[PDB]
Amino acid sequence: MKTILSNQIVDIPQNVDISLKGRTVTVKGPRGVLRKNFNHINVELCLMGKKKRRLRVDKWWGNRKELATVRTICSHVQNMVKGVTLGFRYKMRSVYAHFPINVVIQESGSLVEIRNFLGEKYIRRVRMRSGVACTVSQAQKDELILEGNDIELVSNSAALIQQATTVKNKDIRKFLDGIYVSEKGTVQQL
Amino acid sequence: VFKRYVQIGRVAYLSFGPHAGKLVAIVDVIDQNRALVDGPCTGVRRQAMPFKCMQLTDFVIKVPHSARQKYVRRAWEKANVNEKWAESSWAKKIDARQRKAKMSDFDRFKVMKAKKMRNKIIRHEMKKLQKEAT
Amino acid sequence: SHRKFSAPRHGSLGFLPRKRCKRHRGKVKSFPKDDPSKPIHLTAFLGYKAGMTHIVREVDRPGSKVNKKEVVEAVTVVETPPMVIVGIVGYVQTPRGLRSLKTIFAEHISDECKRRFYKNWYKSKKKAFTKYCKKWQDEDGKKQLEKDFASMKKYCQVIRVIAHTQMRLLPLRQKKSHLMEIQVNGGTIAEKVDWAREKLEQQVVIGGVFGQDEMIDVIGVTKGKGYKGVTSRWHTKKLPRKTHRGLRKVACIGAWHPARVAFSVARAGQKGYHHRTEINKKIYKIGQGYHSKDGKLVKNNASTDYDLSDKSINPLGGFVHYGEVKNDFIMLKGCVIGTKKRVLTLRKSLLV
Amino acid sequence: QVLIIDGRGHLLGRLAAIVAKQVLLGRKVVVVRCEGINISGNFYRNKLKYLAFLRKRMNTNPSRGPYHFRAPSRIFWRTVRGMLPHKTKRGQAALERLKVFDGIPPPYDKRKRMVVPAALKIVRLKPTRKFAFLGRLAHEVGWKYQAVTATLEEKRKVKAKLHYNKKKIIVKLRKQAEKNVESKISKYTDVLKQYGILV
Amino acid sequence: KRVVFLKQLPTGLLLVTGPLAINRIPLRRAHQKFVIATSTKVDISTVKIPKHLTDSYFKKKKEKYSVTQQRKADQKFVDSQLLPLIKKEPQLRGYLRSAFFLSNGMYPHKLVF
Amino acid sequence: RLWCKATFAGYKRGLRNQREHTALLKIEGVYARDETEFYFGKRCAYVYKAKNNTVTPGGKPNRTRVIWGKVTRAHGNSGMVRAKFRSNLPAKAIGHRIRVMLYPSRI
RNA sequence: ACCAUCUGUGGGAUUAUGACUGAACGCCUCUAAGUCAGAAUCCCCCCUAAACGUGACGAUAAGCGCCGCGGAGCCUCGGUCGGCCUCGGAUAGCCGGCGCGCCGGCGGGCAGAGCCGCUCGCCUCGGGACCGGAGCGCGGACGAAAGGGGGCCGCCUCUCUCCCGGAGCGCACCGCACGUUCGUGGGGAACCUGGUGCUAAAUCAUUCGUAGACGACCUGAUUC
RNA sequence: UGGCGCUGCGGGAUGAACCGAACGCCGGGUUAAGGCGCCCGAUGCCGACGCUCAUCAGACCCCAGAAAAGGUGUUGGUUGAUAUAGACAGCGCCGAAUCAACUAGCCCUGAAAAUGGAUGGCGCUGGAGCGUCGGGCCCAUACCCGGCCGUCGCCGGCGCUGGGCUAGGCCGCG
RNA sequence: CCCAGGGGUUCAGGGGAGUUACAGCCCCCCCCCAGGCAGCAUCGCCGU
Numbered sequence A: 001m002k003t004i005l006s007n008q009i010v011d012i013p014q015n016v017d018i019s020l021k022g023r024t025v026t027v028k029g030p031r032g033v034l035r036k037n038f039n040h041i042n043v044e045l046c047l048m049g050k051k052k053r054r055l056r057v058d059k060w061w062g063n064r065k066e067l068a069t070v071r072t073i074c075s076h077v078q079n080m081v082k083g084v085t086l087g088f089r090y091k092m093r094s095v096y097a098h099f100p101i102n103v104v105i106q107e108s109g110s111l112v113e114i115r116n117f118l119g120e121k122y123i124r125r126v127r128m129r130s131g132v133a134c135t136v137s138q139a140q141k142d143e144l145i146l147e148g149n150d151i152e153l154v155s156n157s158a159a160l161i162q163q164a165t166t167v168k169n170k171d172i173r174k175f176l177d178g179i180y181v182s183e184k185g186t187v188q189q190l
Numbered sequence B: 001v002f003k004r005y006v007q008i009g010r011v012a013y014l015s016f017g018p019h020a021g022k023l024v025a026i027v028d029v030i031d032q033n034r035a036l037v038d039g040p041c042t043g044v045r046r047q048a049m050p051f052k053c054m055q056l057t058d059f060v061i062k063v064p065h066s067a068r069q070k071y072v073r074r075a076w077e078k079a080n081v082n083e084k085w086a087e088s089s090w091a092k093k094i095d096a097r098q099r100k101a102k103m104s105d106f107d108r109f110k111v112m113k114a115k116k117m118r119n120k121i122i123r124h125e126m127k128k129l130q131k132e133a134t
Numbered sequence C: 001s002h003r004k005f006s007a008p009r010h011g012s013l014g015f016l017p018r019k020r021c022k023r024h025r026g027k028v029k030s031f032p033k034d035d036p037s038k039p040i041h042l043t044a045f046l047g048y049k050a051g052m053t054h055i056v057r058e059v060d061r062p063g064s065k066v067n068k069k070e071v072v073e074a075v076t077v078v079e080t081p082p083m084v085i086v087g088i089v090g091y092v093q094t095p096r097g098l099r100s101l102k103t104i105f106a107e108h109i110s111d112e113c114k115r116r117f118y119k120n121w122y123k124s125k126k127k128a129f130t131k132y133c134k135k136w137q138d139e140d141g142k143k144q145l146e147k148d149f150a151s152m153k154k155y156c157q158v159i160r161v162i163a164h165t166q167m168r169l170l171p172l173r174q175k176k177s178h179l180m181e182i183q184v185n186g187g188t189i190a191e192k193v194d195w196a197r198e199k200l201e202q203q204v205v206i207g208g209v210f211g212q213d214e215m216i217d218v219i220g221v222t223k224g225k226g227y228k229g230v231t232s233r234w235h236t237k238k239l240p241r242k243t244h245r246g247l248r249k250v251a252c253i254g255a256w257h258p259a260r261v262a263f264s265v266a267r268a269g270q271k272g273y274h275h276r277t278e279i280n281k282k283i284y285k286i287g288q289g290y291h292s293k294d295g296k297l298v299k300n301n302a303s304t305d306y307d308l309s310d311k312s313i314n315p316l317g318g319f320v321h322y323g324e325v326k327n328d329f330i331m332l333k334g335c336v337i338g339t340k341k342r343v344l345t346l347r348k349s350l351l352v
Numbered sequence D: 001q002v003l004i005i006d007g008r009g010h011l012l013g014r015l016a017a018i019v020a021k022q023v024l025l026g027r028k029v030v031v032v033r034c035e036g037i038n039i040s041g042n043f044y045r046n047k048l049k050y051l052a053f054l055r056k057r058m059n060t061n062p063s064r065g066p067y068h069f070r071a072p073s074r075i076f077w078r079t080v081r082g083m084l085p086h087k088t089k090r091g092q093a094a095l096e097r098l099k100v101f102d103g104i105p106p107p108y109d110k111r112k113r114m115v116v117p118a119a120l121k122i123v124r125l126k127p128t129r130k131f132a133f134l135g136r137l138a139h140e141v142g143w144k145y146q147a148v149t150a151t152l153e154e155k156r157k158v159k160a161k162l163h164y165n166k167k168k169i170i171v172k173l174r175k176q177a178e179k180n181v182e183s184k185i186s187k188y189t190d191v192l193k194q195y196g197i198l199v
Numbered sequence E: 001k002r003v004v005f006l007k008q009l010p011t012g013l014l015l016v017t018g019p020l021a022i023n024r025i026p027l028r029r030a031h032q033k034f035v036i037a038t039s040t041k042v043d044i045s046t047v048k049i050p051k052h053l054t055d056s057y058f059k060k061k062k063e064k065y066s067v068t069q070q071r072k073a074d075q076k077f078v079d080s081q082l083l084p085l086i087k088k089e090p091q092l093r094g095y096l097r098s099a100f101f102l103s104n105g106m107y108p109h110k111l112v113f
Numbered sequence F: 001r002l003w004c005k006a007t008f009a010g011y012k013r014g015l016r017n018q019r020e021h022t023a024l025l026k027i028e029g030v031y032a033r034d035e036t037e038f039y040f041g042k043r044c045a046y047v048y049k050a051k052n053n054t055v056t057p058g059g060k061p062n063r064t065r066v067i068w069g070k071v072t073r074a075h076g077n078s079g080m081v082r083a084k085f086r087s088n089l090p091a092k093a094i095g096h097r098i099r100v101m102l103y104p105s106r107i
Numbered sequence G: 001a002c003c004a005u006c007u008g009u010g011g012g013a014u015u016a017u018g019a020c021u022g023a024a025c026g027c028c029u030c031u032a033a034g035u036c037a038g039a040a041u042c043c044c045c046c047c048u049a050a051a052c053g054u055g056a057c058g059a060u061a062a063g064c065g066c067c068g069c070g071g072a073g074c075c076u077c078g079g080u081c082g083g084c085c086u087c088g089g090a091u092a093g094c095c096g097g098c099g100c101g102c103c104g105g106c107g108g109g110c111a112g113a114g115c116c117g118c119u120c121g122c123c124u125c126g127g128g129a130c131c132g133g134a135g136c137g138c139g140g141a142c143g144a145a146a147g148g149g150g151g152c153c154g155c156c157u158c159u160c161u162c163c164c165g166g167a168g169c170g171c172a173c174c175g176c177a178c179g180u181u182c183g184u185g186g187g188g189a190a191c192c193u194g195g196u197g198c199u200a201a202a203u204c205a206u207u208c209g210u211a212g213a214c215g216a217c218c219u220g221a222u223u224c
Numbered sequence H: 001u002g003g004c005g006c007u008g009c010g011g012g013a014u015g016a017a018c019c020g021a022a023c024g025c026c027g028g029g030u031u032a033a034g035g036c037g038c039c040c041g042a043u044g045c046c047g048a049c050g051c052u053c054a055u056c057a058g059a060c061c062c063c064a065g066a067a068a069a070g071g072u073g074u075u076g077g078u079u080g081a082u083a084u085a086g087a088c089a090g091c092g093c094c095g096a097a098u099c100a101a102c103u104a105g106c107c108c109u110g111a112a113a114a115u116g117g118a119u120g121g122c123g124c125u126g127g128a129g130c131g132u133c134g135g136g137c138c139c140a141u142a143c144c145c146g147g148c149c150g151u152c153g154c155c156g157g158c159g160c161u162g163g164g165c166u167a168g169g170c171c172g173c174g
Numbered sequence I: 001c002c003c004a005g006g007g008g009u010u011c012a013g014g015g016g017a018g019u020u021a022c023a024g025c026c027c028c029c030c031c032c033c034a035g036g037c038a039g040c041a042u043c044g045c046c047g048u
Ligand SMILES: [Mg+2]
Pocket: A169
């Protein structure tokens, strides 16, 4: 079974100006610009309408494995839309029982030095991705703030910090110490 | 990105097969592979035909669904498919390719002599503009 | 059929074949990685193993049972007279490896350096580089040489330097010096060629190549032991005394299948005179040769800040089987490969 | 006289099956840019296929066993050799007519390279299937000359583009000359348009 | 070389002419098996061929060959009639002067003569 | 040039048998069976050079020798043809040039 | 002689696994497309060897090397029978022209289904051209991944070249094969010619013992 | 009962027995079984329809490694059950189908042995994989036609002579 | 040439604005099997 046509329309706000160069989607908003290539999906992209622009993702003669990549295109561009308008604010939370986790941000939010994790003398230096800025959260004790335009870069920078604070040779169900992701939000809250 | 689609009334060019070189109108789509084409004004009666031997053209006639040959012929003549195709560069490159294959030895000699002097006149004009520009 | 008691093998398969080294002078097979940030410098130097002795120093490693204690450490004396630069070679990186593009020799080349270009120097007319040296004076040769210097700066990515030892300053019988390419790891190619051009027919001391408290590598050929049995070549177990037809062999040289003796099986052959490269040889002292300071030749390269005895590095009766060390020398911790008076190619460490 | 083929975009066995047939017919083939040759299947498949090839060695003496060449040119050369009777004088003569090169060396940089449509990835493989490059496969098995080849191919495309831009101006000059001398070649362009030479 | 076919002789051989004034090919016989006939025809219905041009006329007389005065007279008798009608076809004077050869890419199985 | 380029692709064979009295030629422009009909009956020639001089018809002796043949039928569907020569082609000619003459003509 | 002493090393893709984004399947999901971390394994560096693999460079003996398409000849070995002197690449898009746009072309005619070269000579029309073309010619730019041309702008000599129409001569060898090229080809030993260039090494014996079963290897071997 | 042994030949990479076919010496033609990416003769068809991605893929008689049991991989089918008096999933909102069981293809898990190695090899993934088929093509010492040799059979022929009839010879036919 | 003259019915891969209207499709009747041209020519088979 191959579906003749499988489409999906994406709404684009007026503050975002989008340009299509083949399959390379480029969005530009108040928070910057983004650019993600989709030449590995092998679909059709089209911008309809001058005002109130939309993004039409078409798939002709695709099986179930190929129809699944249609919404993945749309959900990625929508992340690129809210990344240049609202941004992404991933919040970390350092959980500890006895030894407090000392986090010092260096290189203007491009490096996180994790100290005093489980009382270990080794220092954990986690470098953030390009365009991702880390900052010790205010109005909270052991909370971090990761900001950026690309969700795949901010959420990956959060996984680097979280997997860095991993307990070895212990009952992880008992030693629940580490810096975990507590909230996945946006920089601008509307 | 696509401009030519397979639809009811799409005039297609048969690249190979028993009716290679003729135009047909896609009157119905049987399955993903085959269609029901019919060229009333070209000499291809109504029959099933695969899409691999078709080449979509920029001509779409307004024929109803599963209408008989009397009405498929009207839209073919209403849209002047044969007139627009004969003046299109697609057919003119086909006509030029057919004439080049029918060239005799005397025709090639006339082309050899014509192209020999035509290139030498253009080649000198290119040298003339290069000397002028400098 | 498995061996009941496990045991490691009797050698390293990474030093095969155990043949005589095809060359006598050690070969630097890998120079340090070129870094354009650091200043211009050489990364190799030829030396001659004079002999061994021991020193007394106070170790200063915190946390050791030997901290702040006197130790007697064996050291090796390597007499390294200054080398004369007589050539520049430019290398272009090709998909088939580095390739020698240009080779510019100096205008004047000593007779001890030309001895390397001959097998019978005594009965041969000293004709080497006689027609080439004229290029440095002819206006046609100068222009051709300037095109060769520009070809190195434009096309070459690895600039090496040909240098030779001064065997007149050694107590050795050999007068034929040893030539060697010493890679320059300083900076841009334009600066490496200019630096090497101004160093032509000019001596280079070991004090400029290496420094005090530096881990360097020692390359060269080991001591030839001749044909040796498997008991001495691979250090295998000696068969019991009652073993018929010999007891200093390997009992089983392989199973039935494969029906072939394996290359990993230890066999009898030639031991010693192998090319080796031992790393992390700390320089303990860079001594100065005999030099007249104020009319009197000073011999004080074996005095320390706590000894003050006016004595030279040469012991009583000189280094046995070598001679007298009258030039600049290096002092490496421990032993180095080769016999006495063995030419050693000192190299900077490839590691940080 | 020499069939110069560009290896970029071609499949390993699809191209080797054709090059091996041309050299047997007494034709000299030169395959350039062997690092650009594609192989069907994901990269981890073809990498394991070569790592399993590295294990095939004579247990008693590996210096006699299968020689595992790492260069993409010698990888494609061994693929063509497998489809030739290289143990006969006829097959050895066929190997002498084939010359493989990593990248496009100066002997063939200034040439027009052929393309085999029966071996291209776009024609023989689905757009959704996984493939692997021979340049990356070789780099991860011991090919030490990938970075130097990439930089030399990078400069080769700079001088090839400056020549193409000059070639575009010559075409612009030729098309402009046809309009400025159309009155003098009107009798000649009618002969070519009559016999289908032009249109 | 390209020649003009005149008449078939009783022994099947073809009476072939250049003419001589174009490509230096006199009136001589030619087998049809060793001849490629093109699609170009000139109207020589008005050309009068003498009756004495038989196979014995072109039979080799069997010590150096020399063209006799009868061969030259029969040549000018036929050439004087072919040249006026060849000139009516443009670019045919040089087409008969030219020689035929296969170049790169020209395949006889697809070439139309 | 008055002959077509052909390659001596090999003898008429199976897999474990070889009939050297029939050769398989590959014409440079014929890549289909429907195109081999034009060459049926054309003279084939294996021109080569040797050491000793041999008589030349209509000329002076030289080192050039030749083995004449003729295209007899088609072979397969890829434009191959079969040819029989007065002497079986030597195995050294495999992959070399065979001149396919334009005579006996049928056009 | 661990019975003394010294030294023993860097990366890359990734396995297991834990994850990111994210569908399929309004949710969820490490997976489907796409990403991340990732190891005594694997590959590589380091390290040992160095191929019927090789680069640069030195010196090259009455002999010998370059330079007179040496100038003519004798033996031998193979092909072969017009060139293409070049973008990068995309494949759910591409190419060309013009200052992110606009215009133009796409079953590729700015096209390899292509382009280019291609009258049997030798003299004559001047009808079309200003094709100013042709060099055993002299200079100058451009080449290093396995270095450039049968090419280029320049200066120079002579009397040119292509297309379309006329007038003239040629062994026209009498139907017949190996014709038509690359070719003034690649390799021999010997020739006779005129310009220029230089005049060395290896080996044996001997010696050294940093070396060796024997060869091999490291060395020294005349007037400073 | 056939076959091997007593038997070569084409095919199964290979091999006493399998498949095809049995054999004087040759030419032309046509096939069998089996094949037609290259080795290696033949699909260099603009073959047809689907199935299948395998970090141990798979690749065909004998025949030269797999099972029980599993998979929300994918594709079919079967039998039921909810739903525009508004279900399934997600927090009354949402607004179109959805869910369950079972079965069958391919792939996957189950699946560990010792020198380095075996769809025969190379390699193949818009197929050179599996299933269903079409057209064309490839060659056996088989079949057809033709030549030659020998054997065998002719209620064979000829004593009725340019040649002929050593009749134990000669000639003809199958 | 909706073949023309009387008309009936019918759905939808629903044209025009739900059943022909600004396309068509199908099933049926009574009028010279209306005539006219082709005849296995998109699909088979076989010759004295
Ligand atoms: Mg525990």
